[PDB]
Amino acid sequence: DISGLTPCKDSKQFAKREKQQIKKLESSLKLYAPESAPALALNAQIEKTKRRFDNYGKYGLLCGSDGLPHLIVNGDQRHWGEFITPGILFLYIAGWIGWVGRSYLIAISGEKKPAMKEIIIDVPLASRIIFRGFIWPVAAYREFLNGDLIAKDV
Amino acid sequence: AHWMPGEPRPAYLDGSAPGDFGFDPLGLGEVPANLERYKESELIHCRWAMLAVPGILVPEALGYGNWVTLPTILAIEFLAIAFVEHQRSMEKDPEKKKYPGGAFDPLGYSKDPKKLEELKVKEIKNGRLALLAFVGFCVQQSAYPGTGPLENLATHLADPWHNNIGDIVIPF
Amino acid sequence: LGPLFTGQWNLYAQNPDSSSHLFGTSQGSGTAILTLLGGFHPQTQSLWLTDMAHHHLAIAILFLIAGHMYRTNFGIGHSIKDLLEAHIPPGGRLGRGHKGLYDTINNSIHFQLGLALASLGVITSLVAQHMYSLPAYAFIAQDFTT
Amino acid sequence: VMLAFGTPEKQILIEPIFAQWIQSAHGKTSYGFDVLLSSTSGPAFNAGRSIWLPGWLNAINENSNSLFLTIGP
Amino acid sequence: ELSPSIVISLSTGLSLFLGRFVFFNFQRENVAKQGLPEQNGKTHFEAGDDRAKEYVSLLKSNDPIGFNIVDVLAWGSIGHIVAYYILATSSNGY
Amino acid sequence: KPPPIGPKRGSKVKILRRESYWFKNVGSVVAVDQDPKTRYPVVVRFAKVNYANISTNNYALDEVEEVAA
Amino acid sequence: RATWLPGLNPPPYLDGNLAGDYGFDPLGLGEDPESLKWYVQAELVHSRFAMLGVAGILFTDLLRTTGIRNLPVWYEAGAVKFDFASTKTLIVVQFLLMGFAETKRYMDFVSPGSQAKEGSFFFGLEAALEGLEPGYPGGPLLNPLGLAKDVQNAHDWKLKEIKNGRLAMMAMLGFFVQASVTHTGPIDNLVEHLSNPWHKTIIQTL
Amino acid sequence: MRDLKTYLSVAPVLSTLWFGSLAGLLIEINRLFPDALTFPFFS
Amino acid sequence: SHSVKIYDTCIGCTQCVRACPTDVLEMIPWDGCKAKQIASAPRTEDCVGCKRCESACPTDFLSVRVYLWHETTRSMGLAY
Amino acid sequence: WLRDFLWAQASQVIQSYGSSLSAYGLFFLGAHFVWAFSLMFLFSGRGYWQELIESIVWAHNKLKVAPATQPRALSIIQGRAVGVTHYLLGGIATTWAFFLARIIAVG
């Protein structure tokens, strides 16, 4: 109920959005037979919409006066599924990408012509490294403590 | 002679200073001039807090004032204290800025240097303890608005395993 | 000026145009000249002229006090050169601090111009952000193109 | 896209909680944070309780004027 | 009423006492340490500006510490300031 | 002197020249002109080219500094 | 030796002289040596805490399921309100005491001679904290029995320790996930598996 | 062939392989787990 | 017109002047390099500023260096 | 042309949000974008981007992520090529979306 936003499980305009989209998809449904592929696909999209709205209701999303879910990023424990848990889920993958790429560039750095390994990606080397970014939040922390994360100028 | 035995003591404080335990993890006292100013200010903060804490618990044990008009008492305070503080600022010898002696040292406690060093250690230890005690007073008055320090000690001694800091430090 | 010299400044905030004032006529007006009642005039949806008067007065006190800061021909005041050579942090984080900066600004007209345009642009955006929200002119909030 | 797919309920709408907090920190009761000026018990509200805050509150809460607009995603 | 003629003279005499007796040595120390407002390593008067010429005539006081008229203006500007601050903050019942 | 004056052929060297592309970057000395009249004898060979697609440049003795490795 | 999967040589930065090595470091975490030392102490402490955990869960659930004592489920065990003390006090007391323990362990790890030399007063006991080893402190306080008085030539004992502890950690992860998707105790899940093993497993949870 | 695999490991071929695999992953996730705005597990 | 300058980092490879389409440059003897020659710029009045000279100087940054300056009819390359 | 052709006949590509013609309005805005993005290339020059690239290459070399294939700003002729192709693609896809939605809607 924060920021003047009513939850979507007890919002009027949210249910109105639901009803309006369902009537829109049903207006496009009285043009085909109820057993053919178009009508079946339209009914599947209808159930998709209804479950979508009900899932946004049951997660405790906050729907404003416009009747759309307004995500809360401030750090409220009820709304960590909005930003903070998927934010950690992001940063874990993003640091995976960065860490496997960095360890790859460091792996090829001791090559005769390293640039050809950035064009012709050494798939065995990367694949042996591709899972080494699973542990990036600890390996990077140690490389920061040991001094191996940041390079020295010389 | 170390705040956490095992941590490497920095190079700039090693035990020689009166109250040296090697607690400079942020590296504030790196340069010597700031270090000297810091120990001066430390002694002054210490002496003010040690003047304060017996001016808190003694009114609370008997008076129960809870340690809680302007344009005259404020003026007399500023006049009486700015004079002393600037006259203190006008000294340039640092060991005499921390420990003037002379007209400030009657009773001859500063007559023997070894006992002078031991008493400087005593001053700084009791003073750090009193600074902690005053910060405790302030935060215990912030958390509990309308209670006294000795009142809080009675609250602890009543049921210590149920009335402690934990009630404020975690939400539960 | 009895209230001003006698210190009884509160006598200048006695009848602060008590909410029925028509801008340009004595109906619902008052006698105050300097107020801090804040908010907007109800007719104009603008700031009170007494608030602007007290405002410019207060910042006049501040600027007239601040303009007696820097050293001049009368023996007192600050030298900005030593203010800058004194603001060098021990620790070497900033390094040599603001040393030699008075000479590289005062000789450099482009540095003066850059700092001036910095401040001017920020306060111009401030003029915009505060004239749209806190209009200080009568009947400018209700007209919408200006 | 979510509008182009007729699904405006799927949009990324982040309510500006921090600017709304500053607004409620100045007397705007349109969010219900009740902090430092919308809370009557706040000492900041108690200090200027008799100086400017009546006019400033009936100004900032009045949704016709243009200071501290009701902001959204 | 705080007797607006008594508080103001009181605060002015207070500022002058705090100036001459309590800290003039600190103020004159900081004046001599900050020094003149030099440009390119020299005073403005030493750089060709005929109009600076720090007025030693106005500074030549025979008060035995050196409390010149400018320091009298300084301590007394602060005095009247604190006086009217007290008077105004005491006028309204806030 | 007729013996070498500069770094050894192969000594990885750092560049102190502020206007070069490889400033504060290591190199690899491939030659040192032993003529005691040229101004920039130290022929270095770096690993990554400059903007002109060149990996080598002459440097002076004072515009160069060998690393501890 | 036998290093955790045949057909792969162990990494050259760890081999032989370490508590239950077996050469499993495919993700290059013990590549740096001081990192490996820190991780060894981490592993030992983790495994010992996990062993105490598995004992304190299996024993309590043997008492619970059979019905010797009415102890709560491991899942719903933290919210037990004790009469003499409160959890709000217990967290703070744990913080204090385990801080005095773990910071001492740390300052020994970074400086082995510490906690026993000078001004390290713990009720006059500045001798039981000699350490003798990283991760294996010894002394009358920590090993009163002293089964392994020596510790370098105690590879059997340390190997038993680390193997039982790796297994206890894996069993603790079992307790974490097995009782978050089934919402019962470990012994309940076991006797559910030992009635119809081919019909009650992880994937028989629909 | 060694050179055919050398070409398959080239940056564009491997990029389109990687992004086709990735795109199939995200696509099948947004079909099996469509219309997702909030992470409800341990919410 | 333009101010062409040759600095002492020149190796005497004769590309600056073999690239220069307006005869601005010329190689002269010198004792600062293994080739014993350095470029000079006498005919800067004929310098258009095309910087083909310094697009062919193989040094750390440059040895030849063209400074754009007072543009006349011949530095602007006008047939009218 | 601005009123009766552009403004008016672009009332079926922008109002086509939630319709079957919604990819047309999507590419209307997108081709607008790609055209404008092209203006970053046609207007700018290589030297600024090489200096910026060398700054962020310092930021990479600080973390041992210096790529051997040296990051170079686009060649000048390449900046012009990228500009003209994004400009043409954007203007042309704008027009394509506008025409197709306009003429499919009122048909």
Ligand code: CLA
């Ligand atoms: C950067 C801005 C931005 C953001 C934040 C989003 C965000 C989102 N968009 Mg939008 N979108 C954008 C730009 C953006 N989009 C643009 C530019 C376009 C035009 C191309 C679109 C077009 C678009 C469409 C058409 C749709 C979305 C949808 C979505 C949602 C995707 C949820 C989903 O399926 O993920 C679920 C998660 C994954 C796919 C990732 C899985 C990762 C794997 C499994 C690895 C993780 C596991 C790993 C092993 C670690 C586990 C832990 C342990 C092992 C350590 C989400 C709200 C969809 C939706 O539902 O809208 C609400 C949708 O229908 N977007």
Ligand SMILES: CC(/C=C/C=C(C)/C=C/[C@@]12O[C@]1(C)C[C@@H](O)CC2(C)C)=C\C=C\C=C(C)\C=C\C=C(C)\C=C\[C@@]12O[C@]1(C)C[C@@H](O)CC2(C)C
């Ligand atoms: C500490 C621990 C558990 C401790 C549990 C305790 C105290 C439980 C206490 C309680 O229950 C009781 C007793 C009583 C209850 O009433 C109350 C509570 C309080 C609830 C588990 C650790 C559990 C730790 C686990 C599961 C760690 C697993 C690590 C793995 C698998 C690592 C793998 C790798 O790192 C390597 C080895 C090498 C790399 O190269 C490759 C990869 C693959 C990355």
Ligand SMILES: CC1=C(/C=C/C(C)=C/C=C/C(C)=C\C=C\C=C(C)\C=C\C=C(C)\C=C\C2=C(C)CCCC2(C)C)C(C)(C)CCC1
């Ligand atoms: C909580 C939150 C928030 C906020 C937050 C913040 C404010 C933060 C900050 C933060 C910060 C302030 C940070 C900083 C940082 C810095 C640095 C300096 C870093 C560095 C790093 C590195 C260097 C890394 C690297 C890597 C990795 C690890 C990954 C990949 C690879 C690489 C190599 C890249 C909010 C409310 C909004 C929302 C919710 C959430």
Ligand SMILES: CC1=C(C/C=C(\C)CCC[C@H](C)CCC[C@H](C)CCCC(C)C)C(=O)c2ccccc2C1=O
């Ligand atoms: C932006 C810009 C640049 C810089 C443009 C850069 C170099 C393009 C940005 C890098 C591209 C996108 C390559 C990076 C993607 C690689 C294929 C690496 C893959 C990494 C993942 C995405 C897979 C110029 O060089 C330029 C030159 C002349 C006039 C105008 C301009 C101009 O406007």
